[PDB]
Amino acid sequence: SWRAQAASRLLAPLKLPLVLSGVLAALVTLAQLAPFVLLVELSRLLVSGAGAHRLFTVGFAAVGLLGTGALLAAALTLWLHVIDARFARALRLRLLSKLSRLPLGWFTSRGSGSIKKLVTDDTLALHYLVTHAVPDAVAAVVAPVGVLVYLFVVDWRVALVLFGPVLVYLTITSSLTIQSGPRIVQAQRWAEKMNGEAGSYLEGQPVIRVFGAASSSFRRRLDEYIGFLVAWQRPLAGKKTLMDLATRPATFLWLIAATGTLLVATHRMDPVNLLPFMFLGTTFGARLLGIAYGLGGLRTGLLAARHLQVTLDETELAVREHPREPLDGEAPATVVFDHVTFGYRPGVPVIQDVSLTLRPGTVTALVGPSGSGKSTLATLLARFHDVERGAIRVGGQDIRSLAADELYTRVGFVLQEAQLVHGTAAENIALAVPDAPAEQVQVAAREAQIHDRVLRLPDGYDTVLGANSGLSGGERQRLTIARAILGDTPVLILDQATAFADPESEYLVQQALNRLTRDRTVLVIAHRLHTITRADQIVVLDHGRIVERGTHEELLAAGGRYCRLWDTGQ
Amino acid sequence: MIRTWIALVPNDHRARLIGFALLAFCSVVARAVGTVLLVPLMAALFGEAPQRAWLWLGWLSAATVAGWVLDAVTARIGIELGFAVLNHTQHDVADRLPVVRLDWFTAENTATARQAIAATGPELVGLVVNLVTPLTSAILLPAVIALALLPISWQLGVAALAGVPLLLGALWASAAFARRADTAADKANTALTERIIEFARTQQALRAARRVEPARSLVGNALASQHTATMRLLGMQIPGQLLFSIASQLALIVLAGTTAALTITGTLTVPEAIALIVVMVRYLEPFTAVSELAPALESTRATLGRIGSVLTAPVMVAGSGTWRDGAVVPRIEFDDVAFGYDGGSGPVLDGVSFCLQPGTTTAIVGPSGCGKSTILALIAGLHQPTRGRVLIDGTDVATLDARAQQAVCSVVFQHPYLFHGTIRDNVFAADPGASDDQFAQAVRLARVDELIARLPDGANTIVGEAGSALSGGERQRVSIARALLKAAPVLLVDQATSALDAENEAAVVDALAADPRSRTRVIVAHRLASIRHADRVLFVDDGRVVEDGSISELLTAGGRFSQFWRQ
Numbered sequence A: 001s002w003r004a005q006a007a008s009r010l011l012a013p014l015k016l017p018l019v020l021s022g023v024l025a026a027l028v029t030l031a032q033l034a035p036f037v038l039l040v041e042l043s044r045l046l047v048s049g050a051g052a053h054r055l056f057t058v059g060f061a062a063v064g065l066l067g068t069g070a071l072l073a074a075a076l077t078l079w080l081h082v083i084d085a086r087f088a089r090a091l092r093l094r095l096l097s098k099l100s101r102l103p104l105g106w107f108t109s110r111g112s113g114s115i116k117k118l119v120t121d122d123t124l125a126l127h128y129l130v131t132h133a134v135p136d137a138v139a140a141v142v143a144p145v146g147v148l149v150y151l152f153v154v155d156w157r158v159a160l161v162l163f164g165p166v167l168v169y170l171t172i173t174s175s176l177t178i179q180s181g182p183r184i185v186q187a188q189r190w191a192e193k194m195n196g197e198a199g200s201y202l203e204g205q206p207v208i209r210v211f212g213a214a215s216s217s218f219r220r221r222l223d224e225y226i227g228f229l230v231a232w233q234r235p236l237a238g239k240k241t242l243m244d245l246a247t248r249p250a251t252f253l254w255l256i257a258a259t260g261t262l263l264v265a266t267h268r269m270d271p272v273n274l275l276p277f278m279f280l281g282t283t284f285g286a287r288l289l290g291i292a293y294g295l296g297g298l299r300t301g302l303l304a305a306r307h308l309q310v311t312l313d314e315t316e317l318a319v320r321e322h323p324r325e326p327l328d329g330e331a332p333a334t335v336v337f338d339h340v341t342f343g344y345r346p347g348v349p350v351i352q353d354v355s356l357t358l359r360p361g362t363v364t365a366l367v368g369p370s371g372s373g374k375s376t377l378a379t380l381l382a383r384f385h386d387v388e389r390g391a392i393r394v395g396g397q398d399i400r401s402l403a404a405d406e407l408y409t410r411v412g413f414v415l416q417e418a419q420l421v422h423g424t425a426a427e428n429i430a431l432a433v434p435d436a437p438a439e440q441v442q443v444a445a446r447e448a449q450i451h452d453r454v455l456r457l458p459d460g461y462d463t464v465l466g467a468n469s470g471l472s473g474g475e476r477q478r479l480t481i482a483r484a485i486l487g488d489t490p491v492l493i494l495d496q497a498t499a500f501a502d503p504e505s506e507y508l509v510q511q512a513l514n515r516l517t518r519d520r521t522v523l524v525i526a527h528r529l530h531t532i533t534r535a536d537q538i539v540v541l542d543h544g545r546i547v548e549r550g551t552h553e554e555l556l557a558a559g560g561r562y563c564r565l566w567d568t569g570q
Numbered sequence B: 001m002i003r004t005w006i007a008l009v010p011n012d013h014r015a016r017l018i019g020f021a022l023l024a025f026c027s028v029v030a031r032a033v034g035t036v037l038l039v040p041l042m043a044a045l046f047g048e049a050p051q052r053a054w055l056w057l058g059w060l061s062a063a064t065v066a067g068w069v070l071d072a073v074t075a076r077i078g079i080e081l082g083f084a085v086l087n088h089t090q091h092d093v094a095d096r097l098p099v100v101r102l103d104w105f106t107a108e109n110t111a112t113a114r115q116a117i118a119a120t121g122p123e124l125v126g127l128v129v130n131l132v133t134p135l136t137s138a139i140l141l142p143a144v145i146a147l148a149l150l151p152i153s154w155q156l157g158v159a160a161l162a163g164v165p166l167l168l169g170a171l172w173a174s175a176a177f178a179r180r181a182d183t184a185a186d187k188a189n190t191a192l193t194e195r196i197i198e199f200a201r202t203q204q205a206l207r208a209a210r211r212v213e214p215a216r217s218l219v220g221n222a223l224a225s226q227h228t229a230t231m232r233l234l235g236m237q238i239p240g241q242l243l244f245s246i247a248s249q250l251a252l253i254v255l256a257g258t259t260a261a262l263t264i265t266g267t268l269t270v271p272e273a274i275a276l277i278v279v280m281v282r283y284l285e286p287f288t289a290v291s292e293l294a295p296a297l298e299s300t301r302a303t304l305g306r307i308g309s310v311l312t313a314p315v316m317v318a319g320s321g322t323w324r325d326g327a328v329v330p331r332i333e334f335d336d337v338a339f340g341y342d343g344g345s346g347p348v349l350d351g352v353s354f355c356l357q358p359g360t361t362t363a364i365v366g367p368s369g370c371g372k373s374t375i376l377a378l379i380a381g382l383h384q385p386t387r388g389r390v391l392i393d394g395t396d397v398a399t400l401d402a403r404a405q406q407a408v409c410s411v412v413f414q415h416p417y418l419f420h421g422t423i424r425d426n427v428f429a430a431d432p433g434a435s436d437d438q439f440a441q442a443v444r445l446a447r448v449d450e451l452i453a454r455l456p457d458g459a460n461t462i463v464g465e466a467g468s469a470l471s472g473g474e475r476q477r478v479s480i481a482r483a484l485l486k487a488a489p490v491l492l493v494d495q496a497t498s499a500l501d502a503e504n505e506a507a508v509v510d511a512l513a514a515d516p517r518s519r520t521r522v523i524v525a526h527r528l529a530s531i532r533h534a535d536r537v538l539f540v541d542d543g544r545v546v547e548d549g550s551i552s553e554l555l556t557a558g559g560r561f562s563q564f565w566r567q
């Protein structure tokens, strides 16, 4: 596609440094074309005489102009690569500031290999289109058109032969932009498809070493990528070579030498009129070839610019959507669900009409079968998903009107999959509060019963952990329980947090969490029903709807759905 | 690019690789001869009779046609050497990766592998033409033009030989000025892509810790450093361009001085010097052709360095033994094993010895971080011990063929990782040539049949990147179903119940312990109702097996196991 819409709204702040680099690239190519109009006046001057005082100043004015035109041509392709390295950053800094507020459903559909591509290899695919696209298209129009105009007035007969290569070039370059135009979009579906395979082939390495047949889907999406590159570059490099053999300065120098030795041998021409050809009819080939070899990049920069603008127009999580008012009924740090309805796919719902409310200083349980909307409830409380019906009001105000920088300073979260960033052991505990001086990280680690272990790493609290390069899974979540103890919040939402903890090191972590949160609001999702026997309110939740709520001594002693989820395990 | 790229091409192509460097030398020789044949032509096209320039146009036409043919042939043989290096190296990397030691994949040895298997694309099928063909052609052209100028007069031959050391030195100094800034820009780009992948992967934690805005993101700093590195690279690249311009200018001055001197003294006529001017323009063109190819040269240097670093990784040890028709419900046994991790504290295990009976369930309980998921990884074979021996059915596991020792275990990992696809694809990833009877058996034992009958497009639902399109319990049950669908006569189950609720875990435990296929099962557990069946418990603590025995007698003698659950 040759459309520019959504590719002219994106790269619109470079409005002027493209009209100014078009008059500064059709003025530089007139300075790299000046030495050869002087080598032509000197060549027709040697033949006649012109005592050395005149040959000095046309020979020295053609070896200085070469240097000058080669110097003020690298001063423009350096000013262009600077205002592009400065624009790629200003653009890919708007990308990861825009998709830092898209709903998490936008992340779990692209993956991590199609998001890395979008940011790195899509703002890098606009190079050619930005820097060297207008100069190459404004030089290949003023050098050939004009070096072929000046040559039709010296001799139309010989200059009529130089259209031979120009006509063969125009067909080989027109049967190329036609032939390879589905394979410029078909090759962007393979880049973001091989990035995903590369991501899932290095991370899931312990699985490929046991089952083996899991690498089948990678080794079969690779013989196809190779088979697609093979029959994409095979017929393209031949047409990129037949396009250089016709545009080469050794072809014009033979055509001229062959058609001028026909007009001078038959006395039709004078050999002194060939001189304007030998030095000028060989220049415009470079410009023609440069604009021809740069249509693939020019068309890839229009797909990249269209993928980058359909993303910068997405619907994000607005921070004023609908508040009632900040007051009238609920104290600070009390959460309230009312008639909440949500579903990840438009058709199917996940949670259906849950009411529920958490009091300022009490503990709630949120128990229930697996796959029954509990992590989803916590997630849409964290404002990751923007529920579809009903409201959520933490502290009296809808969470759709909190700045997402005042929301996460009220609610704290210990997620169900303990993920930690690539930093030291103290840049993973002080992640919410990066500046806990040094003896608050130690107190947080002391409360989460991980201080003695972290003080055993190769170099203590300064050991770079990264993605599972230390800290066995049972104690890489006690480092995320400390990350939420440090940076205390008036309401803490604990997910399944003691899943990987033994029942001697979970009795201490859940005892140093009963002393801290004596006035906080807690919601502790749990599957071990014996840890939460002493909660203030247990709420069963199966198939996305509350079915039972009480104090567990009313639950196991009146009714079911809990007296047959607790009796299966005693 | 040379002696590095030559190492990538296979040997069956080392019969048409030394026949490709000949058709390029003949190509540049034809180009140089066609360029030089203009001086005898223009000298007879200006003379008394210009009709004796016909015998000098036949030769120019011959040279031009030969140049056309040779360039087309070397552009056709070029891509056939890219389609044979890309294929070879990609397949070699894909086959090498599942054998590299698990302690090789650090945080920086993983970005390298990911770039090797993800970035290397049209720049491996297009360096054999794009990079090396014009580069060697432009390097060779001035010297051959000088050797062809020698017959006209030797002064110009020795004046144009003096030009090629200038071009070589300009190339060397241009590549040596920017080299540090270039490798720094490469490191910055790699760090930026790694930070971007981390930001896209662990996004909920970053959001809940409000570290997502680029003012405080961990990726904003990487982007800033990447920008400064690229600006420094742009600034350091220009001395190379100025030096190339200076080399061009002074070589042109030497050639023009020799030509003017030889014209004045009386050797060359005036018709000849005019053709020599065109010859020297053609001579100067390679100088401006190499300036473009230098940066691409450094880029392909970096790419091939990455590929080679991946291809020269330390592989895991493996002997040559095999099995007797697989195993036959084997007996695992540790023989004074001791294993410490590569980067970390001292040894996890040190001299742990025990013998597991064949066809018996065995539990491994203990405190957190006390060496259990490392005992399972030593049994499986994912880690070689640093002292001692692991004997499955008597045969040391490290004296077995690499493909005959990954078929005696089916592991359920602590952190389940499913691949991108549907549910049935992941379940069939263990045994792809399975029927529907064994598939239904596996999926029913792991309580995934109700999960499938409870989903809109069950057995075809996408499962996200790892399991992100599934709950923590559904992903774990899919992993259990996958691990049960394999004929390995050893079932290493890890925690594998942490996420299942009270009535899913009881069903899964009963079904897993009521398997029709006889196996040697090993269970690691933190819950008490999760073993309930194992006839032998191993209470590992800090790396030592404090005590073992049956559950019916460990809780009647006051020890670690008795009071490990009362409180």
Ligand SMILES: Nc1ncnc2c1ncn2[C@@H]1O[C@H](COP(=O)(O)OP(=O)(O)OP(=O)(O)O)[C@@H](O)[C@H]1O
Pocket (backbone or CB within 6 Å): A108, A344, A345, A350, A369, A370, A371, A372, A373, A374, A375, A376, A377, A416, B468, B469, B470, B471, B472, B473, B474, B499, B500, B501
């Ligand atoms: N990113 C997603 N896209 C689509 N569907 C999802 C996504 N995440 C979860 N689901 C679906 O929503 C349902 C609710 O799952 P949820 O994560 O709430 O389970 P849960 O009750 O927390 O489970 P457990 O307690 O066992 O961890 C699940 O059946 C799951 O299939």
Ligand SMILES: Nc1ncnc2c1ncn2[C@@H]1O[C@H](COP(=O)(O)OP(=O)(O)OP(=O)(O)O)[C@@H](O)[C@H]1O
Pocket (backbone or CB within 6 Å): A468, A469, A470, A471, A472, A473, A474, A475, A500, A501, B341, B342, B343, B344, B348, B367, B368, B369, B370, B371, B372, B373, B374, B375, B414
């Ligand atoms: N990838 C790794 N690199 C370096 N050290 C590690 C790595 N994984 C674990 N360790 C260390 O080795 C020791 C043994 O860890 P292991 O995985 O056996 O713990 P675990 O018994 O699985 O813990 P849990 O039972 O709580 O999951 C741990 O103390 C841990 O700190």
Ligand SMILES: [Mg+2]
Pocket (backbone or CB within 6 Å): A081, A127, A131, A132
């Ligand atoms: Mg560039």
Ligand SMILES: [Mg+2]
Pocket (backbone or CB within 6 Å): A374, A375, A416, A496, B471, B472, B473
């Ligand atoms: Mg959950």
Ligand SMILES: [Mg+2]
Pocket (backbone or CB within 6 Å): A472, A473, A474, B372, B373, B414
């Ligand atoms: Mg473990």
